[PDB]
Amino acid sequence: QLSSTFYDTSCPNALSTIRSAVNAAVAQENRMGASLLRLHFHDCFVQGCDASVLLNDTNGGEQNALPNAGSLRGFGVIDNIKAQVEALCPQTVSCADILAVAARDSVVALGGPSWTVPLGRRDSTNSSAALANSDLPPPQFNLSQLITAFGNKNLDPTDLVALSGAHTIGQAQCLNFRAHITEPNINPTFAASLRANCPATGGDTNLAPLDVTTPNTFDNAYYTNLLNQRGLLHSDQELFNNASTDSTVRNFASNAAAFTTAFTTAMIKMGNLQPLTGTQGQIRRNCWRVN
Ligand code: HEM
Ligand SMILES: [Ca+2]
Ligand SMILES: [Ca+2]
Secondary structure, three states, rough: EEEOOOOOOOOHHHHHHHHHHHHHHHHHHOHHHHHHHHHHHHHHHOOOOOOOHOOOOOOOHHHOOOOOOOOOOHHHHHHHHHHHHHOOOOOOOOHHHHHHHHEEEEEEEEOOOOOOOOOOEEEOOOOHHHHHHOOOOOOOHHHHHHHHHHOOOOHHHHHHHHHHHHHHOOOOOEEHHHHHOOOOOOOOOHHHHOOOOOOOOOOOOOOOEEOOOEEEOOHHHHHHHHOOOOOOHHHHHOOOOOOOOHHHHHHHHHHHHHHHHHHHHHHHHHOOOOOOOOOEEEOOOOOOOOO
């Protein structure tokens, strides 16, 4: 039911308004492009791409689940974009669609590939912290659990390897990578540099780039890090670890276009997860609350 032309008559200037605002937000802080991409992932993996992650009224709660709390960001950017679009075409463009478009626009703004975003998603009237906890993968997962978690969303291992490349941009907090500092499959010089700003206890919120090579550029350097044992998260390095995914990591390191085309293929699949369409759900007037 999703269509790339969904708003071509009902809100002609929605997409260009979103583009201008996302480009400005990324220019203000490049990390924000990564944050918006991740926000769309955390939407789509939890009862579909339905903007459930944005609710923070009594119908919300996903923001307090372990994978999200103190970690997700960009809510204010999305709210600011939504208000701009509401001023142009009241109660027409869903928050769910804004998240998907903002993710694509963010990737492009940071040098990554474009793709066609199908539209027509509608906004949920509920949320699921329980499903956030069960369906979002934590960084201590091993490859087998990552494959299962993605397979439960009908994403295959290549989609896993390609979507993990989103970590070519953005940052992580010490509390989420400190375990990997001490593990056997990290380069020792790299591990020492991480330890300098990430203690074993305390400093939980100290940041490090997911991609030490180009933290603000959407490129295949994520994969060359893995080949050199400079993945940041445990779950990153699981992809190149005498494992079934090694040959795909090597391919994406040697063939940037193979990576970007696999990435758009997987992003389109992800953005097609369990949409509310037609008359299901609503068009929120404000993304943080149910009408
Ligand atoms: C494959 C399993 C994955 C795991 C275990 C994982 C885990 C994480 C963790 C722990 C962080 C750091 C959060 C923090 O410390 O606050 C992070 C950041 C990030 N993740 Fe993932 N992630 C995964 C897949 C994905 C996917 C599929 C996408 C998008 C397509 C994605 C996009 C991002 C981005 C862009 C950031 C940086 C966000 C920012 O700087 O604000 N990740 N991820
Ligand atoms: Ca959702
Ligand atoms: Ca990069």
